[PDB]
Amino acid sequence: NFTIAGHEEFIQTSSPKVTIDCSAFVCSNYAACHDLLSE
Amino acid sequence: ALAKIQSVVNANAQALNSLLQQLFNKFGAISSSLQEILSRLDNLEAQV
């Protein structure tokens, strides 16, 4: 036969990078709400 | 590579340092640590 055929692989070497604005996530800016976080 | 070695040592020391400093966060009520709370109250409220 001496047949030839394709194959493939996805790998997944990397992923999305994420960051979070800690304290903003916890609270929208409500003033003393953030003050409690500093407490 | 020497810098890499140092970054290992430093990151590890830093992790421990940040852990150490959690002791002084109030996490809540006033006087983040030990006997300071007890000295004012020493009662069921203090236990809370």
Three-class SS of chain B: CHHHHHHHHHHHHHHHHHHHHHHHCCCCCCCCCCHHHHHHCCCHHHHC
How does B16-43 read in b/e, with b if 16+ C-beta sit within 10 Å?
Answer: eeeeeeeeeeeeeeeeeeeeebeeeeee
d(CA B37, CA B44): 12
Which residues is chain B interrupted after (C–N above 2.5 Å)? none
Give the resolution in Å. 4.0
Structure-determination technique? cryo-EM
d(CA B9, CA B6): 5
Please provide residue A18's backbone torsions phi and psi, each rounded to the nearest 5 degrees.
-130, 145
CA–centroid distance for B20 within its chain = 4
Please provide residue B18's backbone torsions phi and psi, each rounded to the nearest 5 degrees.
-65, -30
d(CA A39, CA B19): 18
Run of H or E including A36: helix A32-38
Report the alpha-carbon angle B17-A16-A10, nearest 5: 125
Please provide residue B19's backbone torsions phi and psi, each rounded to the nearest 5 degrees.
-65, -45
